[PDB]
Symmetry: C2
């Protein structure tokens, strides 16, 4: 039965990294699953529908790298992308 | 306030409720300026369904009552079994 000692830390720090990043029009959803004393994180961000895929790959990747690097007790991070029409 | 406020307050309500052995997961979807909240709690596998309904329901009522900017709070349950 997973110890979620850090759910609150992780969710808040991740959300703040994501919401404020380049070309993110908002966070669609965020999910935290407890795994050991660490957290499995799924985040979905809104981006412009007209953005080209290579740049949305970079946008999502930069957020994954940054969360992984900056937020403790995160065993893994998936960053999905939902197109919005602006 | 939206996501961060709501997620933390809900998690703390849920995690500390009496027949909850831990929080399995928590999900927040942004809907307007409010949050759609899905939260799954670990309970004992041998708890009878009517009581786990009450446990989950009390958490839903409490979050809804105490935590602002929350649309639909769904509280699921995953059985844990020591033995
Ligand atoms: Zn995932
Ligand atoms: Zn739901
Ligand atoms: Zn509202």
């Amino acid at each position: 039965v997973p110890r979620g000692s850090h759910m609150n830390d992780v969710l808040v720090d991740a959300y703040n990294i994501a919401k404020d990043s380049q070309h993110v029009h908002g966070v669609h959803y965020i999910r935290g699953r407890n795994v050991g004393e660490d957290v499995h994180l799924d985040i979905n961000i809104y981006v412009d529908a007209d953005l080209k895929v290579f740049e949305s790959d970079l946008v999502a990747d930069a957020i994954r790298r940054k969360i992984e690097a900056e937020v403790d007790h995160v065993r893994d991070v998936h960053v999905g992308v939902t197109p919005v029409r602006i």
